[PDB]
Amino acid sequence: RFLKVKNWETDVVLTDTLHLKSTLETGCTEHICMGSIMLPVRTKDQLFPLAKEFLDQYYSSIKRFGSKAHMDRLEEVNKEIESTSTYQLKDTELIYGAKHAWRNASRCVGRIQWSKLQVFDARDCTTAHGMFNYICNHVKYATNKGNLRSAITIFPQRTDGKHDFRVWNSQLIRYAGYKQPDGSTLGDPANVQFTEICIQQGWKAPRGRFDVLPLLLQANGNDPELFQIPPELVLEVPIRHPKFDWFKDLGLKWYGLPAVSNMLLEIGGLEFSACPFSGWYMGTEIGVRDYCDNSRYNILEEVAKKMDLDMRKTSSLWKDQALVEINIAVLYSFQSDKVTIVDHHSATESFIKHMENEYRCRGGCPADWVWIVPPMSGSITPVFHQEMLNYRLTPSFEYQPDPWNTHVWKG
Amino acid sequence: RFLKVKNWETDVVLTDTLHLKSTLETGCTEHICMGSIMLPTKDQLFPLAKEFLDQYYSSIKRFGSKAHMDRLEEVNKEIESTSTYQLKDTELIYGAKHAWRNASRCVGRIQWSKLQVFDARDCTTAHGMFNYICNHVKYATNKGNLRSAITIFPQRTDGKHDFRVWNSQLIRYAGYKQPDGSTLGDPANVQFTEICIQQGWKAPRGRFDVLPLLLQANGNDPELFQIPPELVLEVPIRHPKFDWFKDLGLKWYGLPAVSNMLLEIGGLEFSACPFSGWYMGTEIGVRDYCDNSRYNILEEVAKKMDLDMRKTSSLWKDQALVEINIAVLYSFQSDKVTIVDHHSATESFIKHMENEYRCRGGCPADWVWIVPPMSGSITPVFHQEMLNYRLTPSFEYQPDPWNTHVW
Numbered sequence A: 001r002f003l004k005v006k007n008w009e010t011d012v013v014l015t016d017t018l019h020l021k022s023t024l025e026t027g028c029t030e031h032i033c034m035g036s037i038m039l040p041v042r043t044k045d046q047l048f049p050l051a052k053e054f055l056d057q058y059y060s061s062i063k064r065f066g067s068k069a070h071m072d073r074l075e076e077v078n079k080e081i082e083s084t085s086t087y088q089l090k091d092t093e094l095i096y097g098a099k100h101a102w103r104n105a106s107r108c109v110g111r112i113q114w115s116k117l118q119v120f121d122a123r124d125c126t127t128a129h130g131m132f133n134y135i136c137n138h139v140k141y142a143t144n145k146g147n148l149r150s151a152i153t154i155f156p157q158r159t160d161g162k163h164d165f166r167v168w169n170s171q172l173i174r175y176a177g178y179k180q181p182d183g184s185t186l187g188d189p190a191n192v193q194f195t196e197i198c199i200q201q202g203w204k205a206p207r208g209r210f211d212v213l214p215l216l217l218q219a220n221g222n223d224p225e226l227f228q229i230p231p232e233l234v235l236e237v238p239i240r241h242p243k244f245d246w247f248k249d250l251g252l253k254w255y256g257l258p259a260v261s262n263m264l265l266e267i268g269g270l271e272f273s274a275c276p277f278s279g280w281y282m283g284t285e286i287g288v289r290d291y292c293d294n295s296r297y298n299i300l301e302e303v304a305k306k307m308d309l310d311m312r313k314t315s316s317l318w319k320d321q322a323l324v325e326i327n328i329a330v331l332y333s334f335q336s337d338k339v340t341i342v343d344h345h346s347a348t349e350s351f352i353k354h355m356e357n358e359y360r361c362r363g364g365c366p367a368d369w370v371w372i373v374p375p376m377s378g379s380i381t382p383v384f385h386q387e388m389l390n391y392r393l394t395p396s397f398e399y400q401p402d403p404w405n406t407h408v409w410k411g
Numbered sequence B: 001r002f003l004k005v006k007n008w009e010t011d012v013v014l015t016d017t018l019h020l021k022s023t024l025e026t027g028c029t030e031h032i033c034m035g036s037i038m039l040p041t042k043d044q045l046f047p048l049a050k051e052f053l054d055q056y057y058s059s060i061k062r063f064g065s066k067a068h069m070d071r072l073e074e075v076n077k078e079i080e081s082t083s084t085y086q087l088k089d090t091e092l093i094y095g096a097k098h099a100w101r102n103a104s105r106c107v108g109r110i111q112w113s114k115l116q117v118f119d120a121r122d123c124t125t126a127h128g129m130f131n132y133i134c135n136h137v138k139y140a141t142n143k144g145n146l147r148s149a150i151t152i153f154p155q156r157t158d159g160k161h162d163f164r165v166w167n168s169q170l171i172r173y174a175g176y177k178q179p180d181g182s183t184l185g186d187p188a189n190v191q192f193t194e195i196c197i198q199q200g201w202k203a204p205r206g207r208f209d210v211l212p213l214l215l216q217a218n219g220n221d222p223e224l225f226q227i228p229p230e231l232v233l234e235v236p237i238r239h240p241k242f243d244w245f246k247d248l249g250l251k252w253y254g255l256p257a258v259s260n261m262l263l264e265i266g267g268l269e270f271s272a273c274p275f276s277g278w279y280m281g282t283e284i285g286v287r288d289y290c291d292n293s294r295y296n297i298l299e300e301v302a303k304k305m306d307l308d309m310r311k312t313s314s315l316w317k318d319q320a321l322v323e324i325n326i327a328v329l330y331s332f333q334s335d336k337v338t339i340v341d342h343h344s345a346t347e348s349f350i351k352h353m354e355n356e357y358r359c360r361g362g363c364p365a366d367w368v369w370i371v372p373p374m375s376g377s378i379t380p381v382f383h384q385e386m387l388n389y390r391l392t393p394s395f396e397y398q399p400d401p402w403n404t405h406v407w
Ligand code: HEM
Pocket: A098, A102, A105, A107, A108, A109, A110, A111, A113, A117, A150, A151, A152, A260, A277, A278, A279, A280, A281, A282, A285, A342, A347, A371, A397
C-alpha cells in the first residue's frame, strides 16, 4: 500500500510506505477521527514477538540481518524470556531503542536532532537516592552552562508492575503552584496538585511565584522520596524585552531545560517507566503556552495594559499583538544569556527538511499535525500547509497513569 | 462507544452520542490518522431517502405519524416509478440548514438555523442561473449587513445533465502568469482564469479583476457572465495607525461564497448550490494576503514597518501578520461590512458546541480547520477536544468540472 501526502504551498507530494510497519492503535476508526484527542505485567506469550520485531530492526539497522550474531542474539533472548519471563537489552540496543523512540515521536517537532541523544544507562540504580544522583548528573550534563545537549536517563525496566521506578514530577524542572483561599493562584496553576503532594510529603514551600519544585522519586515500587535539585544546577533566564524596558519589571523568568519525566519508554516489549529526557525549548512553549494560556501564568492582560493597546474590543487584536511581544522577549532573553532556544519559524522549517529526508531514506515520518503546528502564527510556518500521516511505531514514548493515582502506599 | 471530549482550559467534559449516526467514512483507520489530509439506483436511493425523512419527521415531532408514513410511502413509489424523487420545499430548507449544521470544518455554525434558502430548482439555462446568482449576491450582501444564503439549482439526474458553477467561489480575483515569470493577481486562480480566457473572457490583466461566472446548466457547455460590478461589494484595506498601508493598493471582496461544493440531501445530489455567509478576518489577512502561494505580502509590509528581517527570531513575520490582520478588520468595520475576528468567532463556536452537545448529543468538528491560522492557542477552540465524523445531509467536495466535462 502507498499513501501520498501533499504540501499545499509547494505542491510537493511524498509517498509513505513506512506506515505498513505500524503496530499500535491510533484511536481513530473509519467512522471517527480522534486526531485532536489528547489522551486516546506482560506475558512471555506477547513478549517474544515484540523482542523479535525489535531485534530484527536493530540488526537491519546495523546491516547484520540474518547474521550469526543476529540469530545467536534471538536465541539468547528467547531462552532468557522462557527462563526469567523477561530479558535485558545490550547497551547498544538500549541506545538504539531510545534514539528510535524519539525518532518515532509523532508529536515532536524537534526530531531533526534524533540521532544526537546522549543516553545515560541508569539500569543499575536501586534507590531513590541513587535516582536523585543520576538526575542531577543528567541536568548538569544537559544544561552544559546554557549550551544545551539532548539527553535521556534510563532507569530499570518494569518487572511485575509492583516494583516500578517512577519520577513523580511530570517534568524535571517546574515551578510550584499554590491555590489561595480567595481562589486566586500563586505560581504555576498547572502544578497546584503536584505541589500539594510535595508539601504533604514534607516539602517546605517558599510560596513564591517561581519556586522550583523538589524531585519526588520512586525506586523499585517503594514510596517516593523528596529531593531538592541543587539550585546551582538549575539554569534560569530573567525575561526582558529588547525595546520595552518595563517588561523586566513584570518579574518573569523561566528555566532553560525542558525535561519530560512522566512518560514510558517501550523498547522490544520492555517497559521503562522512568526515563526522563530533555532537549531545548522552542520559544512558543514558554511565550505562548506557559505565559499566555488562561490556565497558566496568564499575563496577556498585564502586558497589553503596559503596551497601552485598545482592550475594549477583541477586534483590535490586542491579545495577538501582546502575544508577539512576549515571544520576542522570551527569544531575546534566552539568546542574550546564551541559552539554547529555537524560534517556531526555524524549528518548523527544520522539521519539514527532516520529514522529507525521512520519507526518502525511511519511507515516512509519522507526525501529529495538531501538535506539530505552533500555537501562534500557524499558517506562516510551513508545517501548517503540510499534510501529515499519524501512526504509531515502536520503540516509542507512551503516556502512563499518574503515579499518585496508582501507587500502593507502604507507609 | 459513547465518546468523551475534554476542554483542557476549563476541564469541561462533554459526552458525544451523535457520532453513532454517522455513515460516511473518515479516511482514518485504527492504524492511521488522516486528520490533516485536505481531501481524503432505486436500491441505494430509498434507504437514504428514508433515513432523511425519518430525521425530518423526528425534527417536527411527528415521528411515526401517518403523514410521516404517507410521505415515506409517496417517496418510495416515486423512486420506483421515476428512479428519483422530488423534495418538498420544507424538506429542502431543512436539508440545506442541516448540511451547514453538519459541516465539521465550519467555525461559524452557531448561525446554522438562520439561513435563507433560494429554491432555484426551476432553473433551466445558464442565463437563468446567472439571474438567480445575481439575486443571491444582492440579497446576501445587503449593502454590507451580510445575510447567510444558499441558492439551490436542479438536482443531478443521470449525471449527464449536471448544473455546475465552474468558479470555486462566486467572487474571486483573476490570476495571470507574466513574462517576468512572476504572477499577477491571485496565484490560486491562474488555471481557472486560463479557462475563462480560452472560453472568450476579455481579461483586463489587473491585480484585482473580479472573475466572470462560468455557468453550466443541464449538462450543457458552460457560458460566461460578468456579475454587475455594482453588486460586488469591495473593501479598500487601510490601517488605523499606519498611514502608508493604503499605498499597498490592497482590497478584498465582502462576500465569501462557496460555489464548487456538492449538497447531498436524502440521497439526492445538488451539484450546484452556492452558499455564502460573512468573513472571519484571518481568512483574508492571514491566508489570502500572507500565504506564500497567494498574495504573499508579508515581506513588503515588514519593510514598510522597518522591522529587522535579518533573523527569523525577531519575529518580524509575526508582527507584520498581526498588523495586516488589524488593518483587515478595521477596513471592514469602517465601511460597515459584516466581519468577525477569530476570537469572537471561536468563542461563539464553543457556545454552539455546548448547545449541540446539550440538545443534539454532539457536534462534528475538524479541529485542524476550526483552529484559526494565527494565534491558535489564545483562542478557546485550541484547547477544545473535538470529534470529527460525517453526518448527512452534507456539503461534499466534488471534481472540478473541466476534468469531467465532455465538450
Ligand atoms: C532537542 C530539541 C527539541 C525540541 C526543539 C523539541 C520540541 C518539542 C515540542 C515543542 C514539543 C511539544 C511540547 C508541548 O507542547 O508540551 C515536543 C514534544 C515531544 N518531544 Fe520533542 N523536542 C526536542 C527534544 C526531544 C527529545 C530529546 C526527546 C526524547 C528523547 C523528545 C521527545 C518528545 C516527545 C515524546 C513529545 C510529546 C510529549 C507529550 O506528548 O507531552 N523531544 N517536542
